[PDB]
Amino acid sequence: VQGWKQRMAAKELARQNMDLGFKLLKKLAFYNPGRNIFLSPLSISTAFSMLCLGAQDSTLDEIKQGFNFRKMPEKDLHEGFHYIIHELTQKTQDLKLSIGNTLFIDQRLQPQRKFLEDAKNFYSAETILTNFQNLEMAQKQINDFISQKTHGKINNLIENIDPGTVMLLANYIFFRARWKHEFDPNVTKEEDFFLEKNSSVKVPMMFRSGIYQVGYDDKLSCTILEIPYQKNITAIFILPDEGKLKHLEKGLQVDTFSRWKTLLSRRVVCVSVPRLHMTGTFDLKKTLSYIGVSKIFEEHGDLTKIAPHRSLKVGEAVHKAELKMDERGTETPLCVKIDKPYLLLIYSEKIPSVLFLGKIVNPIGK
Numbered sequence: 001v002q003g004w005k006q007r008m009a010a011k012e013l014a015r016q017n018m019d020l021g022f023k024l025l026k027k028l029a030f031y032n033p034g035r036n037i038f039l040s041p042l043s044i045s046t047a048f049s050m051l052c053l054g055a056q057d058s059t060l061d062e063i064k065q066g067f068n069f070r071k072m073p074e075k076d077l078h079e080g081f082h083y084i085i086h087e088l089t090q091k092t093q094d095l096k097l098s099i100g101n102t103l104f105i106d107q108r109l110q111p112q113r114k115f116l117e118d119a120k121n122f123y124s125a126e127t128i129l130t131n132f133q134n135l136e137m138a139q140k141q142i143n144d145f146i147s148q149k150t151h152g153k154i155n156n157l158i159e160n161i162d163p164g165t166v167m168l169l170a171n172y173i174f175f176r177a178r179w180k181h182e183f184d185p186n187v188t189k190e191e192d193f194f195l196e197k198n199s200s201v202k203v204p205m206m207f208r209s210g211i212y213q214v215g216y217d218d219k220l221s222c223t224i225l226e227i228p229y230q231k232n233i234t235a236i237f238i239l240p241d242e243g244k245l246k247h248l249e250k251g252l253q254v255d256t257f258s259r260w261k262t263l264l265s266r267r268v269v270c271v272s273v274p275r276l277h278m279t280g281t282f283d284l285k286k287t288l289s290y291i292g293v294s295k296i297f298e299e300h301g302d303l304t305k306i307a308p309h310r311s312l313k314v315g316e317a318v319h320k321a322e323l324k325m326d327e328r329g330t331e332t333p334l335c336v337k338i339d340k341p342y343l344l345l346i347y348s349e350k351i352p353s354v355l356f357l358g359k360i361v362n363p364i365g366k
Contacts, residue, residue, distance in 0.1 A: 009080025182329025
């Protein structure tokens, strides 16, 4: 198979998006406790790798350092990300997934052919001409473009545009997938979800008994539960013990994940999982401060490969992750009840990549 090198590159990139995700989640939760955090570290990485096609010198170097894209040649980096995107991008009965990367550039600028072709060929990234002299009109244009492209999955991506912006990066991902075994919707019931040790809220809770990969981590005081999707993707639920969420967050690592896998076994489990409709919106300028990346957002003369204008920078960059978790699917000595704050990892096994990383403090909250 001629796709061997692309798969190896992707496998290495996947390990690095896991590290990125845990670093981002740790920082986001430290600065914003008691809040849901829902993002795609993979989608975020595709955006800045795509920008590496048009970035030079210090800006290029700092992205590659911050995102850890330095371990392989640039050709392999782009080929690896192309493989991940192409493999995951589907509109089938079992999986609906798209990674969107749209660069909105001021109509007065001239986006260069080579960058345009590479962005489209390697990432399916598109550059759209925008009139930034009318910020209100530019915002409604951007939001309508993305709502239409995503078929109403990614809405209101932009809430504000700063004056002087000539280049806006929009990164967005949506997910719909069928479970390997569907939940019976008639068995789904409104159950208690403990926001705090005393405070509760009624949430639609899905129920099913069957064979599931399950384990317990003594080192991080947490239960691990894997629920497979029909395609080679798994939903990993990490349920900390009472008052161990902060400890679990603090201990998250790449070695953590590979150790959790050594603690799992196939067992008959009665499972209780909340239904979800998660969205997460991030200002990537503030988010990327956590991994020391900022030159891409400053004027440095490093983006001439995109458009020749001297003062060019990425003015604004936004990430939006969207997911639905319900009963849809194909066709006890242990019980795992997800009725308190938990971590959710959507993991692609075939790559293997972290598609989504979520801290769910409230399944029906923002």
